[PDB]
Design a protein around this ligand. Structure first.
Ligand SMILES: Nc1nc2c(ncn2[C@@H]2O[C@H](COP(=O)(O)OP(=O)(O)OP(=O)(O)O)[C@@H](O)[C@H]2O)c(=O)[nH]1
Ligand SMILES: Nc1nc2c(ncn2[C@@H]2O[C@H](COP(=O)(O)OP(=O)(O)O)[C@@H](O)[C@H]2O)c(=O)[nH]1
Ligand SMILES: Nc1nc2c(ncn2[C@@H]2O[C@H](COP(=O)(O)OP(=O)(O)O)[C@@H](O)[C@H]2O)c(=O)[nH]1
Ligand SMILES: [Mg+2]
Lengths: 16, 426, 371, 65, 430, 427
């Protein structure tokens, strides 16, 4: 469905 | 959120395709083990484009490796950077394709592609927002031109609203490392012009002369030719993963460049190249790169640009530089070479500037050209086809497997349709 | 012709030790790797310039394409005959009268070609001196000999070379300094011996006796031997890096420090692990980006720890070492140790206490907790 | 010895001369000497140990730390 | 405080008990000597010398498989009286294990059950490991289940039994001992987790890439299922299950107590770290018929109940989103009378890797135990095999000559005739 | 534990028995003196099955060596292992049988069985838990067929709840080494079918053909043939003495392979056989054993399995190996050879696994097979029995000892009912 990465990689809801 | 799927077919596309992975992992700071090992935070902000984060903080590529013989699959897996791929992405057969187009497309390739797109369907579904495809193959054989053309038509049926882009090595006039080579080239351009949105033609002779005169290499082995092609692969798509002054992804390089659906074969280039002896004697600035960009010796196809006309030219500049001297100087090329560019199109030039130069070199500029002079590369394959086809030579291997003679007449007719349109607009 | 070694690598994910076959071709300097468990090729014949023939001995760690492989076995009888047959291991002693010229002695040994694997500067007690001189228990000169060996610190070194016993005994020469000066002045005892009783060196003669000396000095059980000469007051910490140790500039660093005038309070050799290196560089995490580069350089091999005293001959030790980048050091302060012995910002061959607060904590971490 | 001439299965006789040529006319015939059977039959490498390799013993070992 | 008593009878029970009790020793960090270097009290009873001894019974009529344990690695750990040996085996016959040979040693076992069950402060139930295809495993179990229900009234009795494979065979009279003992255990059991050997042979080749496995490779995969089932009683989690619990949520009727056991993910050490093991991709692996550990296809049948058990770094949020995707799949069909079919039980501890094994070090795992009407396909084939051999009255003189009547053959066929009649009356939509 | 009381009657049984107690002495590492000289402790844990403990660590066989003639007893006691058999176990008569059934069963074989039954009862009660009996004899002789089958009748009426296995040497047409033996073969199988649970028919054309095409020996003496018989005799009880993944005793073989009480005539084979030159070249692998297993050339009886249809087949494997390649191979051979198994019984193959292969070998497997092609063995003897009985040839040696001519009429009447019922279940 969605590939969850680390916080650094600007992917998904990284902002919160 | 901008995703590119890579696919490797053939031997010529596997070695260039493998060599593509040492270049970008050097720019993004990935070890051969699989960890991030670099110096800047700015590399890791866009790693979703090419790589997949796995458990334990290790990165695997998004690429599918297919070839009918396991010899080259063992040659890529046993490389320096070969241990990062997925072990379930290695799809190989057990019988050689035999450099026969009908063996890669009709019988020995027809049982593999059920298991080939099944892996591709996994990697495409888990993406968030897919952007396109990248497939590396060669026109001169039966493996890269057998499954590469087949994987183009099967994927484009599933995913129509994308941009599927192939990097294809074309046959050459003088080298001739295959005997049935114009037969297998013509059978693929019949379906390259139909279901491909962007094709870049790479020549083996033109890469020899760049290495022999501009670089002044003594023995240009095959480890150097793949490293020239790998620079242009990583230069056309640098605006999808680096922040730039004026950003342009592949679909913006789609709308600007192709006026008509059947004219999308581009001539690429790389532009800060220099020799070893004359490093200290060359000035590195934007007006000097522009002359190297438009130089005929720096083009990767055996077509003279002075014997045709240019439809649309694009440039992806790289590094910290101005915008006025970029725009004023590559307009000066259009005014002075006024007769060479077309008259019914104003502004043949698109300019793009990114702010991240490559590893160790402070500037870069990849040339991409859409000219009418590529008809002569397509004319020479058509003429080589006629001399063998009128005697029906080498045609019991194709007709002995299920391929008809009426297929070959349609391919040459569509090839002559393609050379007619380039002259029509000239 | 090729040389085969079996190597261990620790997988960071599975926490698994993995065994590989590493084949090196000394004629052309290219490597190849195979898998023991899966019987498949791991790496084809690739020209690797960093790996060299002098770095191939059993027990060594080599970084091959960002993997640290530890060589544990001999691949076949051919390489077992060509490399491991000639190699011998022996012990070297630096007496208290040769402490000032210990750097020059180490430099002489490095020119002789010995590989130092263990090093310790320490003080010998009376019982340990008796166990060292149990062969001389008939007492020809035992009282003054024990007094001389106990009145000052000594340096014990483990040195490996082909024909090591014969080469070390030939380097030392005659026991009497005057006799050695008369016969062949180039010997270590001839050059740095004030008298026959103060020979300024020591060398074992037989295999069983030498093994007894190692069991006395460097215990294989892992227990603490003789105590180190750690003063823990008015001191700083300095590390000779593994690349400098393998290059062989250790004697030059010792001579340069001695000519500068700072007193070496203590000196030892360590083979560190990644967690120990991380907790030593815990202050450098989040401050510099090449923290992992410094960590990997630190555990890539054995490092020589030093405790340096009083730091006030002409300037402090930090500004004696100079700027962290060797190019900056050469361009601005040409007399500094990093300017003389530095190659890269990562590999600059000396490390100094940047914070004056942290020097005692570093000395406590190295010379108390580790030993 | 035996099987000198090249006919009638000479190769096997040349292979097994050293096993079935141990008498020295003290016993009259090969049949009389091997009435109990040939020395190496259904196997070779006559000196061989019984293996202690049991499936359970090689499976469930003392787990080192 | 919550104690479980495990019974291993037959040759299958002992050889699983070598691999099952290896994991229990390694989960709590218990050495083979019996000493650690209160979560262990379910299997290990304290002694004043700090010695932990298992709460297990090992029963067989041949000591040629238990003497391997007594001279193995764990000789100092098992109790000298918790390994019970007969003298002669039942020799692949049901009547030998039920009336003549298995009657002589039944009194020693229940003497040892009573000694173990008295020290249990709170006993939850019994677990049985046996094989239908053996003389002891199907014969001794049939009267052991009778004399356990008489003494201990309403405790739980779960089963971990090996069924004959549809193609791979060991014996030749395995239809007889399969038919005869299911006439007994239908009314003397509560739930029967069911496995075989062909299905695990397939999984160990295509997933773990072991081309030539042995029983030790199969025993550990069975030994990993039993751990995650019991893992709620041992360790703490978000919400727990119990041996009393999933007995209530997996059988709707007393006659139908035959779920199907599946475990995921199974993968080697090499392939694990290139794939990303999301919570969705391990629960969409259990529903695949190619991963099922019983050789039957659930597309032919319809699910009736399901139990989901989780371990490791699992969030309760994404479990609810993963199950909600499954309920929209058309290829999975439920009965009309079960609108709510799932139960989730969550434990915190990730599974432990056995050194020398082939399974990788994972972060999350799941075991799915679904009641399904598609097990009637598995019994249609073997009920057909019983009729094709009983027609010519083959092998019957081995059975009537040991003490049991010939009339037990026709009665046990009518029992599983009516059991087959029951399964289509349950799977019919209302 | 489970002790096997080996019986040894006749001249043929003595030479098989002398070779049988030589092979399992090599297996357990027992020197000809009687002591133990081994290395591993797996050999000594189960040694009470075949050997009996004495003082000074001396192990002696539990074997009874019986013959009416003392001629071959001197050759047994003067062999390689002649000092290991107990001197009180040599029960010998004074006058030979002379290839007559009646002399060995009614007159001269009637007084010697009282001395044998004292020895057998003493050894049987000395066992902790007796497992069964095992006998080797010859149907074509006088002592082995006439008096060996008398002991089978007397043992069966004293210990009923046991197992009886025989390794009987059935006669051959071209190896006719006695002119009267169809009389002795017919009258022996009349006693065998009612008092025996397993019968392994061993022939001589079967063994002589093997040593020519498989072992290619130029002088195959009887010491070569008795090794192949003794290799089967140790491979059938190998799970009774050694640990393994899946054990199978002697009662497990009788349960699976005997569906009916008058179908107990097996027909054996041994899996790993190759010439001396082919030892270093052939790779011993699980399909290599199974390919040689089911072939009619390696099979140890003078009957072609393709002229009949198999009822039940058992295979006892030895050696460290993997169960998948084992379980797949006898399932695969059941698929192609679907016409060679009867359709009214499914899953006919029995699988047994050990862990200890014999010395100098890594994988071994013994083939035991029930078949309806063994009717071809009994049709040849029955047509020879009638041919003399029409003309009453050699009859005066029989009716002059006590037996009536009606015993010959009922011997063929029961034997003709056996060949009637083997044919019925084939079709
Ligand atoms: N998967 C697996 N199956 C086993 C194992 N051990 C035994 N079995 C099963 O057991 C069957 C063989 O019958 P046994 O269990 O040995 O017979 P038994 O229960 O001991 O009964 P008796 O031999 O008559 O005493 C085989 O078909 C296997 O399926 C094991 O370790 N793993
Ligand atoms: N750049 C590059 N070109 C190659 C390589 N190997 C083959 N080629 C070119 O590919 C052409 C033949 O195509 P081929 O590899 O046989 O096609 P295939 O059978 O589909 O793999 C030759 O003319 C070569 O110039 C390589 O490693 N690198
Ligand atoms: N295979 C084999 N057959 C034997 C052996 N000894 C005797 N025979 C056979 O037994 C038959 C003769 O048996 P005989 O000695 O008369 O039996 P007895 O009268 O009861 O002692 C002959 O046809 C031989 O073929 C032997 O060691 N091996
Ligand atoms: Mg059993």
């Amino acid at each position: 469905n969605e590939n969850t990465y680390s916080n650094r990689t600007l992917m998904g809801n990284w902002n919160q | 959120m901008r995703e590119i799927v890579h696919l490797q077919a053939g031997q010529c596309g596997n070695q260039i395709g493998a060599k593509f992975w040492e270049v970008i992992s050097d720019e993004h700071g990935i070890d051969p083990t699989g960890t991030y090992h670099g110096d800047s935070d700015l590399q890791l902000e866009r790693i979703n484009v090419y790589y997949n984060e796995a458990t334990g903080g290790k990165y695997v590529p998004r690429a599918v490796l297919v070839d009918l013989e396991p010899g080259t699959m063992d040659s890529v897996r046993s490389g320096p950077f070969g241990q990062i791929f997925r072990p379930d992405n290695f799809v190989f057969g057990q019988s050689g394709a035999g450099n026969n187009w009908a063996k890669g497309h009709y019988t020995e390739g027809a049982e593999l592609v059920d298991s080939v797109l099944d892996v591709v369907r996994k990697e495409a579904e888990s993406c968030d927002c897919l952007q396109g495809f990248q497939l590396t193959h060669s026109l001169g054989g039966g493996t890269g031109s057998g499954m590469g053309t087949l994987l183009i038509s099967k994927i484009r049926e599933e995913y129509p609203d994308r941009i599927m882009n192939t990097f294809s090595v074309v046959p050459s006039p003088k080298v001739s490392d295959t005997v049935v080579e114009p037969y297998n080239a013509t059978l693929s351009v019949h379906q390259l012009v139909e279901n491909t949105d962007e094709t870049y033609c790479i020549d083996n002779e033109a890469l020899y002369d760049i290495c022999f005169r501009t670089l002044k290499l003594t023995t240009p082995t095959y480890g150097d030719l793949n490293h020239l092609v790998s620079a242009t692969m990583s230069g056309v798509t640098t605006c999808l993963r680096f922040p730039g002054q004026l950003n342009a992804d592949l679909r913006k390089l789609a709308v600007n460049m192709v006026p008509f659906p059947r004219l999308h074969f581009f001539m690429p280039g790389f532009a800060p190249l220099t020799s070893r002896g004359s490093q200290q004697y060359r000035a590195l600035t934007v007006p000097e790169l522009t002359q190297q960009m438009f130089d005929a010796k720096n083009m990767m196809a055996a077509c003279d640009p002075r014997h045709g006309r240019y439809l649309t030219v694009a440039a992806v500049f790289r590094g910290r530089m101005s915008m006025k001297e970029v725009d004023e100087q590559m307009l000066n090329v259009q005014n002075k070479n006024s007769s060479y560019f077309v008259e019914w199109i104003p502004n043949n030039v698109k300019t793009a500037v990114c702010d991240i130069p490559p590893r160790g070199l402070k500037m870069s500029a990849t040339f991409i050209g859409n000219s009418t002079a590529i008809q002569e590369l397509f004319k020479r394959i058509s003429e080589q086809f006629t001399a063998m086809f009128r005697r029906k030579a080498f045609l019991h291997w194709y007709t002995g497997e299920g391929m008809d003679e009426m297929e070959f007449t349609e391919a040459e007719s569509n090839m002559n349709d393609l050379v007619s349109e380039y002259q029509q607009y000239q | 012709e090729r040389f085969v070694f079996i190597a261990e690598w620790y997988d960071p994910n599975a926490s698994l030790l993995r065994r590989y076959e590493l084949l090196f071709y000394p004629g052309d300097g290219s490597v190849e790797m195979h898998d023991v468990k899966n019987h498949r090729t791991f790496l084809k014949r690739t020209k690797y310039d960093n790996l060299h023939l002098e770095d191939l001995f059993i027990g060594n760690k080599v970084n091959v394409f960002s993997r640290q492989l530890v060589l544990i076995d001999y691949g076949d009888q051919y390489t077992a005959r060509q490399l491991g047959s000639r190699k011998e291991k022996t012990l070297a002693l630096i007496k208290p009268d040769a402490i000032s010229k210990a750097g020059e002695i180490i430099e002489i040994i490095n020119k002789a070609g010995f590989t130092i694997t263990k090093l310790k500067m320490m003080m010998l007690s009376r019982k340990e001196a008796l166990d060292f001189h149990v062969d001389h228990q008939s007492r020809p000169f035992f009282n003054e000999l024990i007094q001389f060996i106990t009145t000052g610190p000594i340096i014990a070194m483990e040195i490996l070379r082909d024909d090591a016993i014969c080469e070390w005994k030939r380097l030392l020469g005659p026991a009497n300094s005057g006799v050695a000066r008369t016969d062949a002045s180039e010997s270590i005892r001839a050059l740095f011996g004030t008298d026959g009783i103060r020979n300024a060196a020591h060398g074992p003669d037989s295999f069983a006796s030498a093994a007894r000396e190692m069991e006395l000095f460097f215990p294989s059980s892992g227990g603490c031997g003789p105590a180190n000469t750690a003063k823990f007051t008015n001191c700083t910490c300095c590390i000779v890096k593994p690349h400098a140790v393998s290059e062989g500039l250790l004697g030059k660093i010792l001579m340069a420090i001695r000519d500068a005038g700072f007193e070496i309070s203590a000196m030892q050799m360590f083979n560190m692990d990644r967690v120990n290196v991380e907790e030593f560089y815990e202050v450098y995490k989040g401050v510099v980006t090449e923290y992992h580069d410094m960590v990997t350089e630190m555990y890539s091999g054995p490092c020589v720890a030093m405790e340096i005293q009083q730091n006030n001959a002409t300037k402090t030790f930090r500004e004696f070492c100079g700027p962290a980048d060797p190019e900056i050091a050469r361009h601005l302060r040409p007399g500094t140790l990093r300017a003389i012995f530095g190659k890269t910002k990562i590999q600059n061959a000396v490390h100094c206490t940047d914070l004056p607060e942290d020097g005692l904590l570093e000395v406590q971490y190295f010379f108390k907790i580790l030993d | 010895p035996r099987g000198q001439c090249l006919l009638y299965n000479w190769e096997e006789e040349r292979a097994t001369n050293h096993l079935d040529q141990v008498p020295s006319m003290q016993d009259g015939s090969e049949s009389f000497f091997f009435r109990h059977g040939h020395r190496g039959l259904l196997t070779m490498q006559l000196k061989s140990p019984m293996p202690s390799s049991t499936t359970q013993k090689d499976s469930y070992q003392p787990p080192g730390n | 405080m919550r104690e479980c008593i495990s019974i291993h009878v037959g040759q299958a029970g002992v050889q699983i008990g070598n691999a099952c009790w290896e994991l229990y020793c390694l989960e709590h960090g218990i050495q083979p000597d019996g000493q650690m270097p209160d979560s262990f009290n379910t299997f290990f009873s304290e002694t004043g010398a700090g010695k932990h001894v298992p709460r297990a019974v090992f029963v067989d009529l041949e000591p040629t498989v238990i003497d391997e344990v007594r001279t193995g690695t764990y000789r100092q750990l098992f109790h000298p009286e918790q390994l019970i040996t007969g003298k002669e085996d039942a020799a692949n016959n049901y009547a030998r294990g039920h009336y003549t040979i298995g009657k002589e040693i039944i009194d020693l076992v229940l003497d040892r059950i009573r000694k173990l069950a008295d020290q249990c402060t709170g006993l939850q139930g019994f677990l049985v490991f046996h094989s239908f295809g053996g003389g002891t495993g199907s014969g001794f179990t049939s009267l052991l289940m009778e004399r356990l229900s008489v003494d201990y009234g309403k405790k739980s009795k779960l089963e971990f039994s090996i069924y004959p494979a549809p193609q791979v065979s060991t014996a030749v009279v395995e239809p007889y001992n399969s038919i005869l003992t299911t006439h007994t255990t239908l009314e003397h059991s509560d739930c029967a987790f069911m496995v075989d050997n062909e299905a695990i042979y397939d999984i160990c080749r295509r997933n773990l890439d072991i081309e030539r496995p042995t029983y030790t490779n199969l025993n550990r995969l069975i030994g990993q299922i039993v751990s995650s089932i019991t893992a709620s009683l041992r360790f703490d989690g978000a919400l727990n299950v119990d041996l009393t619990e999933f007995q209530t949520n997996l059988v709707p009727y007393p006659r139908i107590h035959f779920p199907l056991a599946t475990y995921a993910p199974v993968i080697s050490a090499e392939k694990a770290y290139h794939e990303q093991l999301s919570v969705a991709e391990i629960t969409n692996a259990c529903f695949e018929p190619a991963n099922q550990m019983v050789k039957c296809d659930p597309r032919h049948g319809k699910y009736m109940a399901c139990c989901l058990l989780y371990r490791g770094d699992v969030v309760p949020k994404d479990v609810n989103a993963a199950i909600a995707t499954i309920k929209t799949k058309r290829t999975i069909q439920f009965v009309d009378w079960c609108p709510t079919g799932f139960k989730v039980g969550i434990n915190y501890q990730p599974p432990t890797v056995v050194p020398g094994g082939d399974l990788a070090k994972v972060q999350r795992a799941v075991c799915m135990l679904s009641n399904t009407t598609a097990i009637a396909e598995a019994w249609a084939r073997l009920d057909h095999k019983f009729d094709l051999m009983y027609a010519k009255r083959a092998f019957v003189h081995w059975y009537v000559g040991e003490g049991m009547e010939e009339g037990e053959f026709s009665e046990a066929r009518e029992d599983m005739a009516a059991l087959e009649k029951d399964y289509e009356e349950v799977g019919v939509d209302s």
